[PDB]
Every structure is written in structure tokens, then in C-alpha cells.
Structure 1
Amino acid sequence: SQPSTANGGFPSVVVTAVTATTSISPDIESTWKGLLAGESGIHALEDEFVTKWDLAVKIGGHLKDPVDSHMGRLDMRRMSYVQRMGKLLGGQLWESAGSPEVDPDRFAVVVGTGLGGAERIVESYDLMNAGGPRKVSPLAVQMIMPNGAAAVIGLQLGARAGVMTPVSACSSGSEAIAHAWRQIVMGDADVAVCGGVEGPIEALPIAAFSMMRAMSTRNDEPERASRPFDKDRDGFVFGEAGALMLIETEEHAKARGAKPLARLLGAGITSDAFHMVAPAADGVRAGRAMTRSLELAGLSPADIDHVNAHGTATPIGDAAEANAIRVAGCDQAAVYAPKSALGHSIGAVGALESVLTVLTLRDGVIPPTLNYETPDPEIDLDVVAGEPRYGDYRYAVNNSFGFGGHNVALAFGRY
């Protein structure tokens, strides 16, 4: 037979700490309580760029606690935004894990980024246009290189078993967790910090996705705009986030007295090869990513109690994912779409949702999918709504799909 987590072919891998900053709270346990209480992080945008351009979209979720409120002058001048978010989250996670002293040579970092947080290249041109080539900083390269956020975290925490940055648009944060899991089960590492970071809401990304008709313009009722799987959905809403988790073999956790929050059992990565931005309507390759996570985990579809949907609230996106969940045989699972409350954070969002999937398993509860008022016949899923659903969730799949047709599914189990 082929190796699986269930059959002992791969070592057992557990999640031992989590951290996230969101539009609801800088504290992940407070985000979680807020989600359960039906809170939304989506408000009217007060940024002057909205009025300057009279943007069609006037809603979104900025971080409750801005990263830079924690950043001094040196960091503001010598790191990109996503590097600063990485430093902040990396330090928070390590403290939450009990500041353990690990073997650097068995410790990896895998952190995805999304669509930019891309400010530092332009600033270098400007320096040079005015002052000449000797006015670019000898610090420019480390601030501009797209591996920069993972590099900062690796250097901060002392990771010598690989520092990787996968890029797959909206799935980058989940894909990072996937590669971290691989690095451990293949024997290259015993412990990994993994997840995703992303820049803040800015005018150009809004314009670019708005022009594709991908975004909600329900500006009158910001908290009601994001409606994944609802009949009356009209696109996604941006909500800022960054999220990291600590994963390690069960024996490594045991040896240092860390209590696991959940198990990371398997990961599946596939691709649509269909269209540069739109998902394949049939959901077949996305479904297969789910199936692959189950194969590696040693689970059957019948074992899956819960799916944390990618669920962006676009008309075609949600329809494609409903088909995918059917293809994977998981359409009896209880479904949550967190973007209903937290919005879409592109490179970070899969990581944030992996953390939420962990908390769902730990606590035996799924928050309500906000704004889910009218089921859609083409969807036909069991979507949690109204109030939290307490349940015996034993296994879950977190989905994260990205523009380009990148499909990542992570299988988690209760510990």
C-alpha cells in the first residue's frame, strides 16, 4: 500500500500554536469569539483614495489593530509592510508556543504572500531618478525580494532547514502549510512555522478586481455585503489578515510538553488549467485536491464532518466550489464560509482559514456563515447559519483556491 498518516507511512504532525491579525481583532481567540457572536469585520472604507477615485466599492475590513502601530522607526524604514507583519506575527507565535529552544537544523519556515503588498520597488526608482544610482539603498535588495517576509521570519526565529515562499494568489497561505507538512513528512524538518501574509487594502487592487465584476458593491450595508453561497451574492469583499501556525511531529511536541490543538493529516495541490482568472465550472480538479488530501491522510469522504469553504461570494466561484465538494463526495459535510465575516485577504486567507479549521475541531463548533438567508438550488450544501452549530467534528477539509486555477485542500483532524 501507499503511505498515509492513518497507516503510519507518514509521521504524525500536529498544530501546537496559532496567531492571526484580522479585521475583528489582533488576538486570534478574540476573533474566534467574535465570529461565534456573529460579528463582521467589514465596514465603510474611510480612506481618501475611495473618494478621490469615486470607487464603485466603498467597503472592506482593515485590520482592527494596524501592524505599524507596533513598529518603530528602524523597522518602518528598513522593512517592507509584509516583512513587518511577518516579524510581528512570528514573534507572537513563538511566544504563544512557550518560546521553545528547537534544533535550528530541523526547523523550517514556509510563508506565502499574495497580490503584492508591493510598495518598495517604486520608492527605489524615485530615489534614483532624483539622486542617481548611489541614492538607492544598500538595503533595497532585502526589502524588494519577494522571499523577504519568509526570510525575515527565518532569520528572526533561526530556521535552518529551509525558508520557502510559495506564490499561488489566493491559495498561497494554504499552499505554505501544505509544503511545510511535506517538508516534515519527507524528513527534512521536525518543526515548521507556516502560513501567509498580505498587504493592506489599496486602490489599485480594488479597481482591478472591480473591473472584473468580482466584488460586492452593497455599500449601504457593509456587514451584509459578503454573502457566500447565498442566492443574492454579488462578489467578494476585501478584509485584511495575516496568519501563522506552528506545526511539528507529535513526538517533538510530546518531548517539549506542547499540547496539540489539532492534527494536520494531509494536503492536496492540483490545478485547473482552464482560465487565467476564472475557476472551472465543473469543480473537478478542485474536488481532486480535496480527494488527494484524503488519500494522504488515509480518510474517506464519509469521515469528513466539516468543510471550511474557500467561499468568496462570487457568483461563479461559489458555484464551482459546490461542484468540487460534490466531486470529492463531501457534500454531506457542514460548511462554513468565513469570508462572510472576515472578507478576502488573498495571500493570507488560506492560512487564516486553516487556523479557523483548527479552532473548529478543538472547540466542536462552527460559527454562522453571515448573510446566508436564501439557499441557491445550484449550490445545495449544508451551510451553517443563524447561530453557531455545535457538533462532533472529527475531521475537516479547508479549501483555498487561487486565480490561475490553483487548488489547495488541507485535511485536519481533532486531537
Structure 2
Amino acid sequence: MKRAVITGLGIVSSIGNNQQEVLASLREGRSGITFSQELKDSGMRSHVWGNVKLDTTGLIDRKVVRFMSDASIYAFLSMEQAIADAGLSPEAYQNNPRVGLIAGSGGGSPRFQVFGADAMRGPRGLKAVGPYVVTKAMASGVSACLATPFKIHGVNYSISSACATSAHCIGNAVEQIQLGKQDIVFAGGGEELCWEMACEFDAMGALSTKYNDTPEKASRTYDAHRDGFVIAGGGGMVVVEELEHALARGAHIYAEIVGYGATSDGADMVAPSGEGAVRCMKMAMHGVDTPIDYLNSHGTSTPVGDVKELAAIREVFGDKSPAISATKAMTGHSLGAAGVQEAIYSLLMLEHGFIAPSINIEELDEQAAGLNIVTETTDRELTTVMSNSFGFGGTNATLVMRKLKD
């Protein structure tokens, strides 16, 4: 009955390029959303996005970054952070069959998939395509482009489940620890930000389009006038480690993954059923007898989704409603990367004793009446936290993390 703990974390987000910058943003309720000329020039209605403010040029060995797409790059940088944060020397995690990596993305790389088709149809054909498009566009790019340069010898693959992707990745890593198959598994994911993929969401009306003049107000989970989520890009990675192994080397422990839920709606393709989320959270709560002090919701700032999840939460907790805040109101929706990025925001809140505000709620949706939705940064000692991730296809994931004594 092996225990799984998080001993290191790394992040590249719209609101910060390391845990310190992210910490400050969360505490200040600072938005990472900006106006995107690229999205506007593509012909989209949504002209806002949660972009990574960082020129990654030269941050990765050329011989290595040549095979990578943005999703892989973001995850790579995140992993470097997590390795250092975990205090793992090369000899400690490299060429070690007991050390694996499970990380993916929601869309792989639409940009390079399109680059290849465009190049191929041009005057140069194959010569224009080049020999690096496959590793960049394949769905497992995120895991393949990291496992190889990091000398990973254990498990190596990507779990993909739309907006639940990185959450499932972390959960699966936990399972590897529980099966005694691995001592350490770097888990997380990444996602590129481009009109190529964005227009696809805009074309189904999933993106916000009425607040382009005021980018930082576009993402407004629970607000009565929300009109879709704000697409974002970025990456995240956490070090899931077996408890004894962690203690033995004196690793710093953020928390223990005491609960992992993964269910399926078997209902609608792009809308949640809520019934599945209820089972997902309940599964994650099995054997967890401490109260959930804070719930980092999936809340993407969409009309149907936001309240559907609030309803499931009600069903699960009843008059025991935990503090709730939707960090996407600040960060935007990083899709496949949201799972790990939000587990990190939750771990930071747990580590530093505070609840990040759910911003831009000028008028609370009436269906959210009677819930403890935190709208102002609040200091508080937290012990157990829950984070939800739901994606198209009715795929659900929930992670419950708890502080260890002393």
C-alpha cells in the first residue's frame, strides 16, 4: 500500500515562469490574459489569450530542441525546475529503470501538423517539411521529447484526455508508485498556444468574444456574464515520489496524493453531465476522512460548465461546501496543461497558507448562491485540497492532496 508524495514542481504559465512568480500572481489575483493580434489576424472572434511571457530561445540544447514543439518546450523547462526543486542530481534520476515519466498534451502540435501540410504543398515539398515534424506533431511529443534528453529509463508515455490530460498523468504516476513499479515519476504536461488550434474552439463557440477590449476581464468564472473560456498555453511538471524513497534522501514534501478519481460521463461530447464529476470526486475522497479545505475548480468560465460543476460539488459535499476559487479566471484555460498547473497552484496555496481569489465576479450567477466562493486572497491554514479537471469526451479527473505531519 505504497504512499505517493509530491517532492518537486516546475511551471511555465501565463502568470509566471517559476513558482515564485506564480505565487505572487496568485496572491495578488493578477491576470495573465492579454490581447492577441495573432488570434485577431487569424479571423477569430476571440482576441484574448493566456500567453507565456518568455522568449525560450536558447534555453534548450539545439540538438534537443530541434525535435520539439512548444508543448514539449514548456514541459521541458517545467521539468528542469522540478528536478532542481526536488534536489535530484543527474545520478539520482538518470539511467534508472525505477524512474519514469508520464506527461502529455491535449492537442499535440496543430501548428507543426499544419506547417508540414503547408510546406509539402509548396514548391519545395519534402525539402521544406524537414525531418523534425513527426516528433513535434505526434501526440506523445511531450513525453518523448523529455524522456530522451533526461535519460529516463522507467515508464515513458503520454496520457491524453483533452482538458483532463495532465491530471490523469499525475494520477497514473501515483498508480505506478502504488504498483511498486516506480520510485519516481515526473508527471505533468504542456500545450502550445496558436490560432491553428484556437480557431477550432472559437468555431464551436467555446471561447470568450465579448471582452476583447478588456482582456483581463474576459475570463470570469461564475460571473453572470461569462461567455466562454480564454485559451492559454504553458506547461507544468511535478515530481511524484514514493514516500519512503523521499524520506530516505531527505526530500522536501509538499503533500501526499491521498486521492485520485477518474471517471467517464458516457453522455455528451462537449458538455459535462455532472453525474460523472460526482463519482469522480467521491472516488478521490474514498478513505479521505479529513475535510476538503480548498477546492480548485475546473471552472473555465463557460455558461453551462461552471454551474454544472458547482452542482456536482454540492451533491458531493452538501452543507459541507469547501472554500472554492477558479484560478482560470486569472490564468485562462491551458487545456492539456491545466491539470498539472492547477495542482501546482493548489500545492502553493497549501504550502504557503492562503486561498487564491476567484476574480472578475461582478455579479454572482444565481446558481452559485450559498457557496463559499472566495473572491479575495485569504490567509488560512490548509491541510487537504481538491482540484478538478474535466475535458471533452466526458473524461473526468480529480486529485486530492494533503499535508503530512511536521
TM-score after normalising by structure 2: 0.91
Measured after TM superposition, the shift of residue 73 of structure 1 is: 4.9
Alignment equivalent of 1:114, drawn from 106, 131, 156: 106
Matched, 1:382 2:372: yes
Aligned to 1:149: 142
Alignment equivalent of 2:191, drawn from 188, 198, 207: 198
What is the distance in 2 between the residues matched to 1:69 and 1:220?
34
Match runs of 1:11-410 below 5 Å: 11-47=2-38, 49-51=39-41, 53=43, 55-68=44-57, 70-71=59-60, 73-75=62-64, 77-100=66-89, 101-102=92-93, 104-125=96-117, 130=123, 137=130, 139-200=132-193, 202-217=194-209, 218-280=211-273, 283-295=274-286, 298-300=287-289, 303-329=291-317, 332-380=321-369, 381-385=371-375, 387-410=376-399
- Structure 1 counterpart of 2:298, one-letter code: H
Task: Provide the identity percentage.
Answer: 33
Deviations 1:198-221 (A, max 9, x none): 011x22333222232322221121
Q: Secondary structure at the match of 1:335?
A: strand
| Preserved CA contact (<8 Å) 1:57 1:215 | yes
| Preserved CA contact (<8 Å) 1:17 1:96 | yes
Q: 1:167 to 1:216 in 2, by over 3 A?
A: same
Q: Secondary structure at the match of 2:12?
A: strand
Deviations 1:327-360 (A, max 9, x none): 2226510001010100000000111001111111
What is the distance in 1 between the residues matched to 2:377 and 2:128?
56
Q: 1:289 to 1:98 in 2, by over 3 A?
A: same
Measured after TM superposition, the shift of residue 138 of structure 1 is: 5.1
Deviations 1:272-317 (A, max 9, x none): 111111111xx1211110010111xx114x6111111000010100
| Preserved CA contact (<8 Å) 2:10 2:80 | no
- Structure 1 counterpart of 2:237, one-letter code: L
Q: 1:236 to 1:144 in 2, by over 3 A?
A: closer
- Structure 2 counterpart of 1:270, one-letter code: T
What is the distance in 2 between the residues matched to 1:242 and 1:211?
25
Measured after TM superposition, the shift of residue 236 of structure 1 is: 0.8
| Preserved CA contact (<8 Å) 1:18 1:96 | yes
What is the distance in 2 between the residues matched to 1:144 and 1:391?
43
What is the distance in 2 between the residues matched to 1:321 and 1:199?
26
What is the distance in 2 between the residues matched to 1:133 and 1:58?
34
Q: 1:44 to 1:191 in 2, by over 3 A?
A: same
What is the distance in 1 between the residues matched to 2:325 and 2:25?
15
Deviations 1:125-175 (A, max 9, x none): 456555566886555543343222212222222322211211110110111
Q: 1:374 to 1:121 in 2, by over 3 A?
A: closer
Q: Secondary structure at the match of 1:151?
A: helix
- Structure 2 counterpart of 1:89, one-letter code: S
In structure 1, the gaps of 5 or more residues are: 1-9
Measured after TM superposition, the shift of residue 13 of structure 1 is: 1.5
- Structure 1 counterpart of 2:387, one-letter code: N
| Preserved CA contact (<8 Å) 1:308 1:353 | yes
What is the distance in 1 between the residues matched to 2:55 and 2:190?
14
Q: Secondary structure at the match of 1:293?
A: helix
- Structure 1 counterpart of 2:176, one-letter code: Q
- Structure 2 counterpart of 1:174, one-letter code: A
Aligned to 1:3: none
- Structure 2 counterpart of 1:396, one-letter code: V
What is the distance in 1 between the residues matched to 2:16 and 2:57?
15
| Preserved CA contact (<8 Å) 1:87 1:156 | no
Deviations 1:185-210 (A, max 9, x none): 1111111100111011x223332222
State the Cα RMSD in Å. 2.1
What is the distance in 2 between the residues matched to 1:31 and 1:371?
19
| Preserved CA contact (<8 Å) 2:64 2:149 | no
What is the distance in 2 between the residues matched to 1:52 and 1:12?
48
Q: Secondary structure at the match of 2:8?
A: strand
Q: Secondary structure at the match of 1:266?
A: strand
Q: 1:210 to 1:190 in 2, by over 3 A?
A: same
| Preserved CA contact (<8 Å) 2:255 2:401 | yes
> Which piece of structure 1 moves more, 400-409 or 98-107?
98-107
| Preserved CA contact (<8 Å) 2:164 2:338 | yes
Deviations 1:7-50 (A, max 9, x none): xxx32211111110111221122111112112111121133x51
Q: Secondary structure at the match of 1:121?
A: helix
